[PDB]
Structures are given as C-alpha cells and as structure tokens.
C-alpha cells in the first residue's frame, strides 16, 4: 500500500515538486488538497501516495529535505507548495557546496536524525508500508551525500521495505563543476548496495533531447524537468491505478531485477513534447511502440542497441486496442529478438492504463533493465578516474574526515558493476 | 459425503467465484442462499432458516480480490468468516507465500477450515483451486496442502491448478513458482486438473470469437468445465460419485495424477440457433486437440484411463455406438496394463449457462477426462523455461532472501525430471 516519498537537495526538491504537481492533477487533487475529479479510478489507490486527513482533504506523504534553507521557500512558493505537511520540511543552515563528504558525514549527519523522526512518523501512520522513493541528484553534496546517508539509515531501520530512487546523473553539458563525478561515484557505490530499484535519469540525455530533438537552443532546468516529470508520472502509473502488472514496488522489482546489483533502469517515453506546443496528432499504437523503444526517447544516455535487455516493462496509457498493443509488443520482440536475452523467457511485460497523462490522448512509458546502461557508468568512471588520478580537490573531502580509500572502494564497485553488465551481455543459453 | 472447496490467491478466488455462481444456478439457489419451494448438500450446508451455504473457503494474502466477493452479488452467499485476507501479498514469489508471509496466516486458515470440517458428518476431502504462477497460488497452497496432509491424512485432496500462459502472464518467475509448488504438492495431492490459460485463451478467441479474452471470459469457460467435472459429486450418478473414485478411475499410478480435460461443444452465445450436435459429433470433438484444457498432443502418447461425462439429452446406446466408432476410426492407444474401457456417466439435466456469459445453451455436452502420457509435454515446456533462467541463477536471490534454501531449486527440478521419466516409462513406446 503506502509509499513514503523523500526529496533531497535542490534537484531532488525541484523534480520532486514537479512530480507532486503532475500526479495531483492526474488524481484530481487541487493545491488545497480537495478532490475535484470525475473518475472513481482517480481515488481508488490515492492512499499509495497521499495521507487522507479530515476532510476530505489529501496530503502528500512527502518529506522535504535540504541543507540549504532557501530550498524551503522556493518549494512553498510553488503552485502546490502549501499542500505539504509543514512539519515535514527539514532543513539546515548552510549546505554542502557540492561536497558529498559534507552531505553524508558532516553536515548530513547533523541533520539526518531530524529527517528520520519525520520518516518514522509518516511510517507509523501507514496501514501497510510498501517502501520508500527518493528523488535526488548524484552530482551535488546534499541530494547525493545526505541522500545516500538517509538511504543507509532507512535500510537499517526498515530492512524489509523496498527502496526506490529517482537519481539524476550529472553531465558536463548541464553543470559546470568538475567534482560532480566524485560525488556521483561515491553515490553510485551506495545505491548499488542499498537500493532495490533506481531510475537512472541522465542530465546528458535530457539536455540532448531538449537541444537536438526539441530544438531548444538553450535548455533550462525547467526544460529538463518537463521530461523528468513526464517520465516519473509514467513509471509510477502501475502503482497509482488499479491493475494486474507491477502493481506494487516489490512485484515490479521481482519482475525487473534478476540479479540484486543490476537494478538500474533506463526510462523512456513517447511522445516527446516541448512544453507548450503543440499537441498532436495522437500517435498510433505502432508509432507509440516504436518511439518508446527508440534510443532518442531514453532518459539515460545509452544506446539500447549496444547491449541487451534483461527485463522490460512497458506501460500504455489512454484509450486504444488492447489487441493492437499485444500485436505490436510481440512484433518488436521477435523482429529484434537478438536484443532480448534468450535465457529470460517472456521478459517483456505490458500494462495498459485507461487514463492518459495531461495534454495527451495516448502515451507510452518504457522501463528497461538493459546491459547498455554500462555506458552511463563507464562515462562517470572515466571522468572520475581522470580527476582522481591527479588527486584534484581530494583534500576537500578528506578534510571532513572521509577516508581516501572510500574513493577507491567506490570506483572499484562501479567498475565491477560495469563488468557484470558485460558478462550477462555476452552470456548465451547454449 | 461432504466436500470442502478451498480457493487460494487471485486466480483461485476468481475462478471460485465463477464456479459457485454456476453451482447456484445449477441447483436452483439464489445469491442469498435461499431455494424456492439432497444431492448438492455435499457442497452446500443448510441452516435452520433454509439458507444453503457453500462449503467453501477463500484465502488471499492481500485483500483486493476477496473484497470484491465481500461487496458483490454473492456478498451474502458465503460464510463471511470463510473469506480470509492478509494485507501484504507474496509478490509473485513462492518463498514469500510458503515461508514468510504465508506463515503469518496459515493457522487462522486451518482453524477456519476446521470449523467447516466440524460441521461435516462424513467429510470426503478437499477441492483446491489456485494458480501455479502467483506467490500465493503456488507458495501458500503447498503450505496449506502440507498442513492439510498432517491434519486430515485419510482425506482425498483434488486440485484445479492454473498453468501459466504468456498472453496473460504477470511475472517472469512463474516457471519457478510452478515447478516449486508441483514438487512440494505432488506427495499431498491425489489428482490434479491442470488448466492451461493458453488453451482457454485460444478457445475463447476461436470458438467464442472474443478478440482479446479477459479473466472474466476465461473464468466462465473454466468454470463450465469444472462444473462438468464436479457434477458427479453434486448429483445422483454412477461415475465418480466421490473423491476416492476420481483417483480409482483416473490415477492408476500415484505420481502420474494429472488428467487431461477436453470439453465440447463450445459455441458462441451469438449462435443461439445453431443446429444441435449429435452424441457422435460431441464425442468425436473430445479427441480434437483444439478442445483440450491443456495444450499437448494425445496421439503422441498413450492413454491410461478415459472417462466420458455427458450432460443433457444423451441416449446410452448412442454413446456406445459413438465410442465404438472412435475405437475403430481413430488412433487411441491404451497402455497394455489397463482396461481400454471408456467409463461413461450421463447426467440427463441440460447443461446450464450463466446469463450474459459467452456460451450458447446446448442440448448435450460432454467432458472427457483422460490420463494420457501426452500431458508431459506441458511439463517439458515449463521445465525448459525453468532451466534457461536457473542456469544463470536469474531471480534466485529473491527466493533465498525469503526463507528458502537454494538447494530447493535443484531438488524440485530433479523431481520434475523424475516425473518426466515416469511418463516416458509408462508410455513404454
């Protein structure tokens, strides 16, 4: 049933606020928490993401965290800013200046128990807690450093719950800080060990989609976050509406994760639209199917055709022929059979949900566990290694009492992750 | 004399709904249990107020499906205490259903079953409905079957098991769950009727012209077939009149206890004025692979047993002639150690269909139950998918994390390999 949502750091709260805006509209909830829609499908599983106070007013089960105090104000002044539980804002005075060590050890640790108190409270008022979802960037200090600390503390305290993250990966094309590969590698190390499912949201991919496909010569964070919100809506559809397939976090995980460390998903969706123009036409089912598998529609900067799919979940939204969906999904699987691992029979599951996302009559969301995601980690690794070999800015981390061996531990783990993807990429049934 | 039906997990519960729906229609019982104005009292108890109540338990580890039963058309038919739910399901994981989550509710289920058993003056045993594929249908069922074997050792246990199909599958690990539950249930089950969701799916598309079958389509057809099979228990008759007799007639050799069901005719409700089929025609249709509940080819195998269960306007001499015809038109090879005599039961009541189902009324229908070595093809298909994944240990950590030893995979798989050789040895050619 219940999911507790945590958003950490600037990026975490920005895409986090966007997520809540988007699913609130889908569910008919206005910024005061009142339901105002005309479908019973909207409310049937509202309890997954919303607490229901009297009455009848709905409050996001969301905890909002940052070491930077200013982040409070921007969230609150946002459209749905007043809907969050005032007591669930947990913030610091300074914040980490892109220092993962500050986030985790120093400054996060100072904050963290406050956050956990709020988490604990949201949890005890749950009928049957499913688990947690975290939105954060990997490239900064708070979302990354403190976020992974939170995850490790939550793992200790709720060891049998599913831990899910929406983690946005740094790219030189979007942010001008060369320590971001440090922060991301230290984080990837934590996620490999402590999350069950991680959606890899690549700022590299988001920027390229905006620049090259959507033709936005100067993409803003707002441009990027429009892609993220559409994706987050899509990948949580099965959790938020009645249905048969992947209806909860654990069932999704058992279907998507054949090996515990390989739980980094590549999300995609169709159609890709620039915010505020225009429309349509609505896609056909074939058009949807083909675009949602297209490398250009992925939120991770990897070419899926460079690797193989271990598992895939595909979600079709809107009114459409279930039979035409079945035919097209069968089509893409056997025309491209060499791209789907042969030793996991029937590894593509398809869901249909009848309520389309805003602005659309038909849309498709793709969730892939593909060996091609090793390209993302190889990219981070190469930048990490370039910096770490010259030991640049290392004292900024060790100055917070961090062991230098942690850098080497994280690097090795990530390179091990890459080797593992390659191993199963070359594996054969024979 | 009494039989208790137990429905486990989403599939078992939803098929159960369809079955009891049809049973009420067949015995003239309303959704509140009243009967306007003896045989069916094996499946229904009776209160002092004239209320007929199913001898049935519905169990799920999660409440969604059973909450529909509790609030639906038959909200007043069942004992409310025999509708039992946890809050957290088995997540498509046999080990959760068997070892973790299932252990949380197993004692309540057994105590509630005990309450039904205490109302019986001569309990025959249990009919158990579940999927192979879900964590609950697979894991909890085998836990329940183990415990029922300790608590009712003399009783018969029959299964209706839903064999997975890709068209309606919801988990990659369903081959794992299927082989794990078969391994641990084999010893405790006396007779098990597999229902291949792909066979049912195909029949719906081909004979009922349903473009994209839903569980509601599949289940009404499945329940029509289950009713043909259990009718002998609920009416006067001379064939399969109690659970013991099922094993006697269909299971000569205790590990090979998986009969193939074949049913005819299946005719679209849109074809209400179809010319009626003869006894000869429906009997012949029983040896067409297209009408089987499990996809396999019986001409590739040998028969160990064969029962024909007719319903409706069926003259015995016509059955004998129809049987004589097939025994000399058709290649039906029996094994050399059993009577090649088809056993025949006839129920003269016209078959019942649910209004607003997809089936047309017919004047005569037949369910054939045969034990054929051909059904080993179904096992081989599951075993192969099992082997592909297990070679890589794909998904195995999910099970080991939930109270299960890794060794149990290979043990279950070897048992399956043994089951397949049992079929090969019996089908001596």
């Amino acid at each position: 049933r219940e999911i507790v949502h945590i958003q950490a750091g600037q990026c975490g709260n920005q895409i986090g606020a966007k997520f809540w805006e988007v699913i609130s509209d889908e569910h008919g909830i206005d910024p005061t928490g009142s339901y105002h829609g005309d479908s019973d499908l909207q409310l049937e599983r509202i309890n997954v993401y919303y607490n229901e106070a009297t009455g009848n007013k709905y409050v996001p089960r969301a905890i909002l965290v940052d070491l930077e105090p200013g982040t409070m104000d921007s969230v609150r002044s946002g459209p749905f800013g007043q809907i969050f539980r005032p007591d669930n804002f947990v913030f610091g005075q300074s914040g980490a200046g892109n220092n993962w060590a500050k986030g985790h050890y120093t400054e996060g640790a100072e904050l963290v128990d406050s956050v956990l108190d709020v988490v604990r409270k949201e949890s005890e008022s749950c009928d049957c807690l499913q688990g947690f979802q975290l939105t954060h960037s990997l490239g900064g200090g708070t979302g990354s450093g403190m976020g992974t600390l939170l995850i490790s503390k939550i793992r200790e305290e709720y060891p049998d719950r599913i831990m899910n993250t929406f983690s946005v990966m740094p790219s030189p094309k979007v942010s001008d800080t060369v320590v971001e590969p440090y922060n991301a590698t230290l984080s990837v190390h934590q996620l490999v060990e402590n999350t069950d499912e991680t959606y890899s949201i690549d700022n590299e991919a988001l920027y390229d989609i905006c620049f090259r496909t959507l033709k936005l010569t100067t993409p803003t964070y707002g441009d990027l976050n429009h892609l993220v919100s559409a994706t987050m809506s899509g990948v949580t559809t099965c959790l938020r509406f009645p249905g048969q397939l992947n209806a909860d976090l654990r069932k999704l995980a058992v279907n998507m994760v054949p090996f515990p460390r390989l739980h980094f998903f590549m999300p995609g969706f169709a159609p890709l639209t620039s915010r505020g123009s225009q429309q349509y036409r609505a896609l056909t089912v074939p058009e949807l199917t083909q675009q949602m598998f297209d490398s250009k529609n992925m939120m991770a900067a990897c070419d899926p055709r460079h690797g193989r799919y271990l598992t895939v979940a595909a979600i079709f939204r809107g009114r459409m022929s279930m039979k035409e969906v079945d035919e097209q999904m069968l089509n893409v699987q056997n025309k491209n059979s060499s791209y789907f691992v042969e030793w996991i029979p029937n590894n593509v599951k398809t869901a249909v949900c009848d309520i389309p996302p805003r602005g659309l009559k038909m849309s498709a969301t793709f969730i892939g566990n593909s060996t091609a995601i090793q390209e993302l980690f190889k990219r981070i690794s190469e930048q990490f290694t370039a910096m770490f070999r010259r030991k640049a800015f290392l004292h900024w981390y060790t100055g917070e009492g961090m062991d230098e061996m942690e850098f080497t531990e994280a690097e090795s783990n990530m390179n091990d992750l890459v080797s593992e993807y390659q191993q199963y990429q070359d594996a054969t049934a024979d | 004399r009494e039989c208790i039906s137990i429905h486990v997990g989403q599939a078992g519960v939803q098929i159960g709904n369809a079955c009891w729906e049809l049973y009420c229609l067949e015995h003239g019982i309303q959704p509140d249990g009243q009967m306007p104005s003896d045989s069916f009292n094996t499946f229904f108890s009776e209160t002092g107020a004239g209320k007929h109540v199913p001898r049935a338990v519905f169990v799920d580890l999660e409440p969604t499906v059973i909450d529909e039963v509790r609030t639906g058309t038959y909200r007043q038919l069942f004992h409310p205490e025999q509708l039992i739910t946890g809050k957290e399901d088995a997540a498509n994981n046999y080990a959760r259903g068997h070892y973790t989550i299932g252990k949380e509710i197993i004692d309540l289920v057994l105590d509630r079953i005990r309450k039904l058993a205490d109302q019986c003056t001569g309990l025959q045993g249990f009919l158990v409905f579940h999927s192979f594929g879900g964590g609950t249908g697979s894991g909890f069922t085998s836990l329940l079957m183990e415990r029922l074997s300790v608590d009712y050792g003399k009783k018969s246990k029959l299964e209706f098991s839903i064999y997975p199909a890709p068209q309606v599958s919801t988990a990659v690990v369903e081959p794992y769950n299927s082989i794990l539950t078969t391994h641990t249930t084999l010893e405790h089950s006396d007779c098990a009727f597999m229902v291949d969701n792909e066979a049912i799916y195909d029949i719906c598309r081909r004979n009922l012209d349903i473009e994209r079958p839903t569980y509601t389509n599949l289940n009404r057809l499945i329940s029509q077939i289950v009713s043909s099979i259990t009718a002998s228990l609920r009416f006067d008759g001379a064939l399969n009149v109690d659970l013991t007799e099922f094993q006697t007639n269909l299971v000569p050799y205790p590990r090979i206890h998986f009969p193939l069901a074949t049913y005819a005719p299946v005719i679209s409700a849109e074809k209400a004025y179809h010319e009626q089929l003869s006894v000869a025609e429906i009997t012949n249709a029983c040896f067409e692979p297209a009408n089987q509940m499990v996809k396999c080819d019986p001409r590739h195998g040998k028969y160990m047993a064969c029962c024909l269960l007719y319903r409706g306007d069926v003259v015995p001499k016509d059955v004998n002639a129809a049987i004589a015809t097939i025994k000399t038109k058709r290649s039906i090879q029996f094994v050399d150690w059993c009577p090649t005599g088809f056993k025949v039961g006839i129920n003269y009541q016209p078959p019942t269909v649910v209004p607003g189902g997809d089936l047309a009324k017919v004047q005569r229908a037949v369910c054939m139950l045969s034990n054929t070595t051909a059904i080993a093809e179904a096992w081989a298909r599951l075993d192969h998918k099992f082997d592909l994944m297990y070679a890589k240990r794909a998904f195995v950590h999910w099970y080991v994390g939930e109270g299960m030893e890794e060794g149990e995979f290979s043990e279950a798989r070897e048992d399956m390999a043994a089951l397949e050789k049992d079929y090969e040895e019996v089908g001596v050619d």
Binding site: P260, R261, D403 | -
Partner: peptide, 15 residues
C-alpha cells in the same frame, strides 16, 4: 577517520 560502505555489503539482504 570515517568508516565506509564496503563492496558486497548489500548482498547479505538476500541470504
């Protein structure tokens, strides 16, 4: 100096 997460620590969750 601060103790840190080791490789493989999360593999215990499934045994």
């Amino acid at each position: 100096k601060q103790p840190f997460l080791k490789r493989g620590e999360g593999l215990a969750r499934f045994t």
